[PDB]
Ligand binder design. Structure first.
Ligand SMILES: [Zn+2]
Ligand SMILES: [Zn+2]
Lengths: 609, 53, 265
């Protein structure tokens, strides 16, 4: 009826896109008369391109090629990113209208309001550049040869390098158009961190963490600082800033999570109560504990291996459903039901505990039902529940689930091997594959799949290097230097050390264990296995301090390290620090066997000249 | 101690209502506690609910 | 010595006892001794502002865990009922506030009772009670029970109001996602909703209708199932909380859902 008006076309394209009509919405947009006379007749022009970019924000593009079999170098890569072309045009239009109105001198309030939108536009541009979407490679050229497609693929990395250099271009105007823009500085911090200019990274993150209040995005920078400083251990000031951060806001649980995890890594865990209880006191009395707060406390107790209390706290954290922690808390609940003890899934079960394990699986499946099918990790936790079943026929089902995970990620032995050499996108499922292989009795392919997962996280390079490095920086591997909840690579290298112990080549096992220990002091299990390694070579001296650390970490809860550390001291020659250990064992576990006759009597014999 | 299996209050139920879509974002208003079978006196319970803290 | 102070002021006609009682009430509020305050009020015979001050902490309890808030309203109604015996607009507003948190408990536990048909009948009764309970709380249950019985129409209205609330809030929301997903994966047409006729003029009305659509006569609603009562033969009248229910459901319950009054025998 009235095709001049485009206000209606706006919500038309919006509704079409939101209902999944993609090509239809694109054709709706490109059909606009304004798309290639008051002041406002400028701005809505650009608006359509915005919407275009939005409906093409999630759309996977490819790198354009030439039909001869080569990449079309004369065809720009961002041409494939039609949304990037869209907002390239849009930002040019916005600066052109800025120069249009720079000589108008209208009512200044609209000038002031307009003065900030281009910042949003170019920041979204930079985000699209750094978060680019090169499509998965085609298969027709795979069905041609094994060298031509390889030589053709050698331009996609050029494409991403070009795009990120464009982003590094975008940063300056991004910050320059608005300094009050918290997101602009945040993105600038992230791209600077991707480049390597650590000085600028510190500037951006510090600026964000000052002026951003009333928003949680600060935490996204905060973790960055916590990885920025602890990348090389040169700075530990983040700690201080953290409490300073926590000085301003106590209710910022999402920062408190990284606080707890970094403290866990530094081994200074129990002091976290300083920040914790005041936050607990921050909430007014007579009110239910905040679900985030409950998740925080349960996370703490899980790091303290108080899994029975952590179960309750996490179940308190789930209420009410739909909260941002609800998926997280449910995932943690399933994890701790799967791994209640320090024994994780890839241990070997050497009657009575099998039935309790089955009951755990009942609880786990019952709780896993609550997680939506749309959630990606739901099927991974399904496969992990089937792992918990430990039925050797269910291993086939488990690997089927874990190898549908890769097909989800992309969106005979040949099928699993083609799932193998694909791009490493979902490390959780890859660890699931490794467990699948190991509990199937397979160790070579388990080593291969874990090796591919490790290669994704670049802690491969030190195994052979450290031998000749010590023969003639011991850099903490940058993968582990996160302090976020992603524990997957930690368990990955724990698994790898476990395998190496099983094959008994304890050198590189102790090596990677020392690597993660340098990364993390709270990994009590690794302390235990390192001490076991030292026992295997009878080097009780280092094992003694490691087991003391492990005893502190377990909070005296075990008798096993009782006999372990007591024997370690006793064969070490100085069990005067083992007598108190033995009595400490007897104080709670008054009937731990083999104590009263083996150790302190031999200690008295050793005390005699 | 025979009340640690509280999640059963949604276990055999949600199995028929969650298997399709992600409607969990809507069920925030559901109370964790159920309703029991006893007559509550007007005044005998206020002391025990205010004596928690 | 507040107990001595009030007696001293009363025996010396010190009419300023209101300020003294206000100071005592504020002091007990600061010391969070609601039990002492309500005992003082019931020994002093104060009813309406006493119930109001009880409800002041009642809503503060209600905003996180309201199973005590419904009890607070119940004994507030009991206090205003005892006001009648103490004697020898607000007459029914107190009962409205008390009954405002009646329906929600059994509306939520109807899923546990597995008879999901009455869940919608309960859920569509809190529309008039949007002031006491926020509509975002109730419309979630309304849409949920509309989905669980596979009916629509009312769910469209609930989702529309919920999404308008969300758009008011943002000026990334998942209730728009739920509304669009359900409306495109299912037919969004209202099912049969007129199944009860008016006892006066014979006009078929909604099961949740508070008044007739033709003759405009209010109907007393069932206290547990929520259906409007059309015949007084199957209507059971409670003599304590002054409420009505249906015989076929109240025979199962030995006590009233509101007051739990024991049956005299
Ligand atoms: Zn009528
Ligand atoms: Zn009654």
């Amino acid at each position: 009826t009235d095709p001049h008006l485009s206000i209606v076309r706006a919500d038309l394209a919006t509704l079409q896109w939101r209902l999944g009509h993609i090509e239809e919405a694109r054709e709706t947009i490109v059909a606009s008369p304004v798309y290639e006379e008051a002041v406002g007749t400028a701005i809505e022009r650009i608006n359509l391109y915005l919407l275009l970019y939005k409906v093409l924000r999630d759309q996977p593009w490819t790198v354009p090629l030439s039909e001869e079999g080569t990449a079309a170098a004369d065809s720009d890569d961002n041409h494939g990113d039609a949304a990037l072309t869209a907002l390239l045009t849009a930002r040019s239009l916005q600066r052109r209208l800025l120069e249009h109105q720079l000589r108008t001198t209208e009512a200044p309030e609209v000038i002031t309001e307009q003065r900030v939108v281009m910042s949003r536009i170019c920041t979204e541009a930079g985000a699209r550049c750094i978060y680019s979407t090169p499509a998965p490679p085609p298969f027709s050229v795979v069905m041609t040869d094994k060298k031509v497609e390889a030589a053709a693929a050698l331009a996609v990395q050029s494409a991403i390098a070009s795009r990120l250099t464009n982003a590094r271009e975008y940063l300056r105007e991004a910050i320059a158009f608005d300094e009050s823009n918290e997101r602009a500085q945040l993105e600038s911090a992230q791209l600077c961190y991707r480049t390597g200019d650590t000085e600028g990274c510190e500037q951006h993150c510090t600026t964000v963490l000052r002026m951003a209040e009333g928003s949680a995005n600060t935490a996204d920078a905060a973790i960055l600082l916590a990885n920025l400083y602890t990348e090389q251990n040169r700075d530990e000031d983040a700690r201080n800033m953290f409490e300073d951060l926590l000085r301003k806001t106590p209710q910022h649980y999402e920062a408190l999570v990284y606080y707890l995890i970094l403290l866990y890594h530094a081994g200074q865990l129990p002091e976290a109560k300083e920040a914790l209880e005041r936050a607990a006191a921050a909430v007014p009395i007579g009110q239910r504990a905040d679900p985030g707060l409950s998740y925080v406390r349960g996370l703490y107790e899980h790091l303290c291996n108080n899994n029975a209390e952590a179960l309750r706290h996490f179940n308190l954290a789930r209420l009410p459903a739909g909260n941002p922690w609800c998926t997280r808390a449910l995932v943690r609940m399933i994890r701790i039901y799967l791994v209640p003890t320090t024994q994780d899934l890839w241990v070997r079960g050497t009657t009575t505990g099998s039935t309790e394990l089955h009951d755990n699986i009942r609880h786990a499946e019952q709780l896993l039902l609550l997680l939506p099918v749309h959630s990606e990790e739901r099927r991974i936790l399904q496969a992990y529940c089937t792992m918990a079943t430990r039925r050797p026929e269910e291993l086939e089902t488990a690997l089927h689930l874990f190898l549908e995970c890769i097909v989800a990620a992309e969106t005979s032995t040949a099928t699993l091997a083609f799932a193998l050499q694909c791009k490493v996108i979902h490390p959780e499922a890859f660890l699931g594959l490794a467990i699948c292989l190991f509990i199937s009795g397979q160790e070579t392919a388990a080593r291969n799949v874990l090796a591919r997962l490790l290669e994704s996280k670049d802690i491969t390079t030190k195994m052979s290097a450290m031998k000749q490095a010590e023969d003639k920086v011991l850099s903490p591997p940058i993968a582990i230097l996160t302090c976020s909840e992603d524990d997957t690579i930690e368990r990955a290298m724990l698994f790898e050390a476990y395998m190496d112990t099983q094959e008994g080549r304890l050198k590189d096992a102790r090596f990677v264990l020392q690597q993660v220990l340098s990364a993390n002091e709270g990994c009590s299990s690794a302390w235990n296995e390192l001490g076991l390694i030292y026992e295997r070579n009878q080097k009780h001296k280092n094992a003694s301090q490691c087991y003391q650390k492990a005893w502190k970490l377990v909070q005296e809860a075990d008798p096993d390290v009782g006999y372990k550390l007591g024997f370690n001291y006793l064969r070490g020659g100085q069990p005067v620090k083992a007598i108190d250990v033995c009595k400490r064992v007897l104080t709670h576990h008054a009937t731990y066997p083999r104590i009263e006759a083996d150790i302190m009597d031999a200690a008295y014999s050793m005390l005699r000249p | 101690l025979n009340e640690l299996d509280v999640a059963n209050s949604w276990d055999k139920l949600l199995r028929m209502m969650r298997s399709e879509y992600d409607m969990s974002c809507l069920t925030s208003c559901l109370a964790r506690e159920l309703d029991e079978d006893v007559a509550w006196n007007p005044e005998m319970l206020l002391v025990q609910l205010t004596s928690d803290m | 010595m507040w107990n001595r102070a009030i007696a001293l002021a009363k025996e010396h006609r010190l009419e300023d006892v209101g300020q003294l009682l206000e100071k005592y009430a504020k002091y007990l509020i600061h010391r969070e001794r609601l039990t002492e305050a309500i005992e003082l009020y019931r020994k002093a015979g104060k009813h309406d502002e006493a119930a109001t001050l009880l409800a002041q902490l009642g809503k503060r309890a209600a905003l996180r865990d309201a199973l005590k808030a419904k009890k607070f309203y119940v004994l507030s109604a009991l206090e205003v009922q005892k006001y009648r015996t103490t004697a020898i607009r607000t007459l029914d507003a107190a009962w409205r506030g008390a009954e405002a948190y009646h329906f929600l408990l059994m509306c939520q536990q109807q899923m546990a009772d597995r008879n999901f048909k009455a869940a919608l009948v309960l859920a569509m009764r809190l529309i008039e009670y949007d002031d006491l309970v926020a509509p975002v709380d109730g419309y979630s249950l309304i849409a949920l029970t509309a989905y669980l019985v596979k009916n629509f129409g009312l769910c469209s209205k609930a989702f529309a109001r919920l999404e308008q609330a969300e758009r008011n809030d943002e000026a990334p929301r998942p209730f728009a996602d739920l509304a669009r997903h359900i409306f495109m994966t299912h037919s969004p047409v209202d099912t049969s909703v007129d199944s009860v006729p008016c006892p006066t003029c014979g006009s078929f009305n909604k099961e949740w209708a508070q008044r007739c659509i033709k003759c405009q006569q209010p109907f007393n609603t069932c206290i547990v199932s929520g259906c409007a009562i059309v015949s007084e033969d199957g209507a059971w009248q409670c003599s304590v909380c002054h409420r009505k229910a249906l015989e076929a459901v109240v025979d199962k319950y030995r006590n009233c859902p509101l007051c739990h009054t024991p049956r005299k025998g």
